[PDB]
Amino acid sequence: SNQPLKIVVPFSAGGTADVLPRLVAEKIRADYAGGVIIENKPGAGGNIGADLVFRAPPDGMTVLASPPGPIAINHNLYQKLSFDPTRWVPVTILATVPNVLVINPKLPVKSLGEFIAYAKANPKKVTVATQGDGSTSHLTAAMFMQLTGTELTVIPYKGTAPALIDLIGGNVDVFFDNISSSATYHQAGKVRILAVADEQRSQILPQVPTFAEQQWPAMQAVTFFSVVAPPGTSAEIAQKLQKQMALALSSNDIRKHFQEQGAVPCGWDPSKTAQFIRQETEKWKKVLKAANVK
Ligand SMILES: O=C(O)c1ccc(C(=O)O)cc1
């Protein structure tokens, strides 16, 4: 078709939600006469761009590349959504990535223990950025507060990218971002990452310990980036698109870029993708209850 493939990322450009489909989009451009364009449609925790793709023609030329918010979390948190995430047509999972605790380095804090005490001394004073209500950074922050007894004031953003800008600029204190987008700044000293919310360390930040190592093993928060087609999209179209992307994800160049920012390439078929989204939808639903989020 002379039309381009429209991949909608419902978060600000500059974060992991943007860069992973963008890297893959470049590899699959030869598959489409009209090309492959990324469209950034941020706002409302990813629901604006999500609603946009949800209403798009089910022809497989408009798709949503999104982290879990609009995919597996928002419908169990928001009072009413204009779309039903259980009706997405799964294409594939691009990658899973662990979340980490990022702080502004100018805070008088160099460890988790110091941070917890620093927040407990003044409840509500320490501000925590999020990528929007229902994002994993939101639920990971709430998860953290439940386990530690700290009280952080949530500040939502249209994505990781504007949140990091403010964090580095001293306008927001902490951020439970995913490691991929924050590691770039940690190496340059622009931020300080205190811990990884995963069972193993990440090899891009070998010195940053897991929460579990720091004796907070209940801090387990791994996000994932999915590709979904509008409701009604045929299984053939979704499968042909997942194969195109699975081919991209298997190349050395993409594996290298993914590996180097701590992203784990997946590329599963739509059926395994569908199961995984069910498993994750259930996982985060329990986090919603256990930390009662809002
Ligand atoms: O919900 C998440 O985990 C998530 C949200 C936004 C972004 C981004 O703005 O790149 C990345 C991850």
Numbering used by the authors: 28 to 321
Question: How does the study describe this entry?
Answer:
TphC belongs to the TTT family in Commamonas sp. strain E6 and through biochemical and structural analysis, the ligand-binding properties and 3D structure were determined in both open and ligand-bound closed forms.
Purified TphC was readily co-crystallised in the presence of 2 mM TPA and crystals diffracted to 2.4 Å resolution. The general architecture of the previously reported TTT-SBPs is maintained in the TphC–TPA structure. Superposition of the open and closed TphC structures highlights an ~36° closure between the two domains upon TPA binding. Upon closure the solvent accessible surface area of TphC decreases from 13,048 to 12,495 Å2 encapsulating a closed cavity of 280 Å3 in which the TPA is bound. The TPA carboxylate group buried deepest within the pocket is recognised and stabilised through direct (T155, T242) and water-mediated hydrogen bonds (T155, Q150, N197). The binding pocket is bordered on one side by a conserved aromatic residue (F30); the positioning of this sidechain is facilitated by the proximity of a conserved glycine (G178).
